[PDB]
RNA sequence: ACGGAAACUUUCGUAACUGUUUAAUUCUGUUCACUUAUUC
């Protein structure tokens, strides 16, 4: 009738990504937009807005029946999973994400690191001169786990399609690992890896069997 | 802090600052990595980062002439010994950011 | 006969949320709806209207016996806890809420922060062009306690259902932690955490035993 | 305050304001974070925020040409030294909001 | 006063008033907070509220096109300079309420 | 000169029957705040009023301060009356009794 | 040695019950720390 499904997993970053954050003032050694972090502390965290904005785009191009043009108006078979501000049949979303926080600080200092992020030097060639525009970016360190929990809930009507809902969610998790997750990741910056993909119930109403 | 940083930095020698903002992109990030970690934990735990931070001002002053002339005038090595408290350490981090703003105010 | 039950707790925000406040004039750096605060001072506070409007909605979809359509006219077993403008048996509510005020300012200034809220940069992709509509929002900082006190009182008739009343209230507190609390929480902005959930008596009439 | 802010801001050089309201979304918020805290506590406690607030103006005058021409004309660095009282500090916060209104009145 | 406010407001451009009474819920309320304070104290004390009240009109003339066409026609900035007395300031508060009633009669 | 509304305002009041919501949406008409008045209490003796004049002033003075601690009007149980005698002075017109017990 | 004398429009009563500024949205699309170079 009403259950709570939480997809608890650990996102293992095998390659340092780069997501444009707010004000470019996290360090006095940069010149471009670094990575958004925590306003109170200073731990490299990834928001949840980049997860829904990337997973929905890469999934609506294989499970669709019409050429897209504008968001929230393509492929009705997956519009009920995210949300639609135009359809009168549903308005709220049944897939609540969460801002993943870096929880690898309990054993990172024991190995002896420099800080939490690094500055990578890059440039470009105009095919007429040597080095031009000596810019720089600030990526993330390697091996940094996170806390990703996908909250799922039914609303009574979710009856003759529960088995089909898990097929789209499970296929979307393995599809994100084969693509970059960030900004300007065409050169090889993103590529996540969901470690320990498990799902448990907290409210206690739906049995667990389709774990993997 | 900020009042004595506008007259001491201007008093130099030859014009046209040869040292750009690209060759100083390490000592400015190491000091910023200590101010944010000092508010989370205590001062008695970060005793290894303070010793490693002082060595950076010695190695950089033996490879470029544009480093020794700034440490002896701004008294960088002297402020690294007076610090001993968490509140005193936070003052040295804010003083380093003041020398960067006024550096690009007259040139670049 | 007549007791006063106060559910004193501390709401710990584990994720920065975003609730559309009043006019967009709390800062000269925004362009959209910020977060409601204090008219006299300047401390980020959350009103009590968002707590009653969200806890009642998420609870009336599991403890009901008929498909709802309009507010204050669904599931009579929980209508007496909030109120009903149509039933002649009761009119006033027995669950008086309270606007939670941020009481974390006693130790926040010791750590040295920038302000009290941050400006997060967001945009959208039309799947035909690059960046479009460079908008911006204003979320809340992490780790900020609040003063949440649920005032409860009986009216003599509350006799053979007191034990059932605490079951619905306790189930609604743990259910709010598994869902966003605010606006645009589909990407992972809400998700509160009731820390130190305790209940005491001020008037002195009903014994305490069902603390947890 | 408001009378001299309508003629000094108009007197510039090249037309078409290249500086937008997106690249100045920090120095305009730090001044608002000080006016609201001055009415709760005294002025002798916020001595650390005043020093850090002055560095932000000098740091912006070296990375963009659209900032040096605004500080030297509006005398931003001069007003940061005359302040010393709680009532005087509140006047500088209201003067900064006036320059933002008249900036978008002629362009954007 | 009330005679030139019935013909100047009607003379506009494109029909269907896009601006509603929801996006102007500040500049119309701050002027009411000055009329009640002008009758209690003198005019030489409220010199800080007059400077801040003028900034609200200029700040809105750059964020929406429905404001520039109203200030230049009704001469809002011109009336804010002629005022100097307690009796003259009370006239501007009554003139602003006249432009709101006729704005909702023809449209809304 | 200060510019006010008019002279009498309208206040919205109702009642609760403890079984329904709003009942009998009535209204009243109260008076404005800060409004002085001209109150003159005339006192005259009649020859016999001789060995009790000093005692009469004790009752009148006590009655003036007692009215300020009580409502003066209708439905004053919620706090509508409560007057305040400002500039309490006494003078003579005919001139036959000296003034000394002013306050 | 007044068509006068003695006298509260007073006593009673929340403008009340009900209601998330909410649904939708990657700060990303292009970019070698490069060019000339006997540890002889």
Query: How many angstroms separate the CA atoms of A27 and A149, rounded?
Result: 30
Query: How many angstroms separate the CA atoms of A117 and A130, rounded?
Result: 29
Between vectors from CA C115 to CA C110 and to CA C117, what angle results, nearest 5°?
A: 125
Residues 6+ positions from C109 with CB-CB distance below 8 Å: none
Q: Strand A95-96 relative to strand A148-153: parallel, antiparallel, unpaired?
A: antiparallel
Q: Are A148 and A11 in contact (CB under 8 A)?
A: yes
Q: How many residues does chain A have?
A: 212
Query: How many angstroms separate the CA atoms of A169 and A153, rounded?
Result: 13
Query: How many angstroms separate the CA atoms of C188 and A82, rounded?
Result: 12
Looking at the C1' of nucleotide G14, which residue has the nearest alpha carbon?
F15
Calculate how close chain C gets to E1, using CA atoms only, in Å.
Answer: 31
Are chains A and F in contact at 3+ CB pairs closer than 8 Å?
no
Does E39 touch chain F if contact means CB atoms closer than 8 Å?
yes
Between vectors from CA A151 to CA A148 and to CA A156, what angle results, nearest 5°?
A: 165
Identify the sign of the CA torsion A73, A79, A84, A86. positive
Experimental determination technique: cryo-EM
Are chains F and D in contact at 3+ CB pairs closer than 8 Å?
no
Q: Are C13 and C192 in contact (CB under 8 A)?
A: yes
10 Å CB burial of residue F89 (0-12, 13-18, 19+) is exposed
Q: Strand C136-140 relative to strand C148-153: parallel, antiparallel, unpaired?
A: unpaired
- Could you tell me how far CA D4 lies from the centroid of its own chain? 15
Distance A35 CA to G31 C1' (A): 19
Distance F11 CA to G12 C1' (A): 18
Looking at the C1' of nucleotide G27, which residue has the nearest alpha carbon?
A20
Query: How many angstroms separate the CA atoms of E68 and F40, rounded?
Result: 60
Distance D32 CA to G27 C1' (A): 25
Mapped onto helix, strand or coil, the DSSP state of residue C9 is strand
Residue listed under structure tokens 């009796």 = E87
* Chain B residues touching residue D52 (CB < 8 angstroms): 94, 97
Query: How many angstroms separate the CA atoms of C31 and C25, rounded?
Result: 9
Identify the sign of the CA torsion C123, C125, C130, C133. negative
Chain pair B-C, CB pairs under 8 angstroms:
4
> Which nucleotide lies nearest residue A50, CA to C1'?
G26
Mark which residues 8-27 of B lie under 8 Å from C by CB. none
Query: How many angstroms separate the CA atoms of E69 and A105, rounded?
Result: 57
- Least CA distance to A28: which residue of chain B? B28
Does F21 touch chain C if contact means CB atoms closer than 8 Å?
yes
Q: Are B105 and B2 in contact (CB under 8 A)?
A: no
Which value in Å is the resolution of this experimental model? 3.3
Does D7 touch chain E if contact means CB atoms closer than 8 Å?
no
Residues 6+ positions from F43 with CB-CB distance below 8 Å: F56, F60
Query: How many angstroms separate the CA atoms of B66 and B14, rounded?
Result: 11
> By C-alpha distance, which of A42, C188, D61 is closest to A34?
A42
* Chain D residues touching residue A25 (CB < 8 angstroms): 26
Tokens of C98: 């309270």
Query: How many angstroms separate the CA atoms of B78 and B63, rounded?
Result: 21
Query: How many angstroms separate the CA atoms of E58 and E75, rounded?
Result: 12
Looking at the C1' of nucleotide G36, which residue has the nearest alpha carbon?
A130
Residue E60 CA: distances (Å) to CA of A29, B40, D46: 37, 42, 32
Tokens of F22: 């709003």
């Amino acid at each position: 009738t009403f259950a709570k499904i939480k997809f608890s997993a650990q996102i293992r970053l095998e390659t340092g990504l780069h997501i444009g954050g707010s004000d470019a003032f996290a360090a006095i050694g940069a010149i471009d937009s670094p990575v958004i972090k925590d306003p109170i502390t200073n731990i490299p965290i990834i928001p949840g807005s980049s997860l829904k904005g990337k997973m929905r785009t890469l999934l609506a191009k294989v499970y669709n029946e019409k050429v897209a043009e504008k968001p929230s108006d393509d492929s009705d078979i997956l519009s009920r999973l995210f949300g639609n501000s135009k359809d009168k049949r549903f308005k709220m979303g049944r897939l609540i994400f969460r801002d993943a926080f870096l929880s690898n600080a309990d054993e990172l200092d024991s190995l002896g690191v420099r800080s939490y992020t690094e500055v990578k030097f890059e440039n470009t060639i105009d095919r007429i001169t040597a080095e031009a525009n000596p810019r720089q970016i600030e990526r993330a360190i390697r091996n940094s786990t996170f806390d990703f929990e996908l909250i799922y809930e039914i609303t009574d009507e979710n009856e003759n399609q529960v088995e089909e809902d898990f097929k789209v969610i499970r296929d979307g998790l393995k599809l994100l690992e084969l693509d970059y997750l960030g900004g300007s990741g065409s050169r090889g910056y993103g590529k996540v890896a969901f470690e320990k993909l498990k799902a448990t119930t907290v409210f206690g109403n739906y049995d667990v069997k389709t774990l993997n | 802090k900020a009042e004595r940083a506008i007259s001491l930095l201007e008093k130099d020698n030859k014009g046209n600052y040869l040292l750009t903002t690209s060759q100083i992109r390490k000592l400015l990030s190491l000091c910023s990595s200590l101010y944010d970690r000092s508010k989370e934990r205590k001062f008695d735990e970060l005793i290894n980062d303070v010793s490693y931070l002082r060595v950076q001002f010695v190695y950089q002053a033996g490879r470029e002439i544009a480093v020794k002339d700034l440490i002896e005038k701004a008294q960088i090595l002297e402020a690294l010994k007076e610090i001993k408290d968490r509140e005193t350490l936070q003052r040295f981090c804010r003083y380093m950011e003041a020398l960067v703003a006024y550096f690009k105010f007259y040139g670049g």
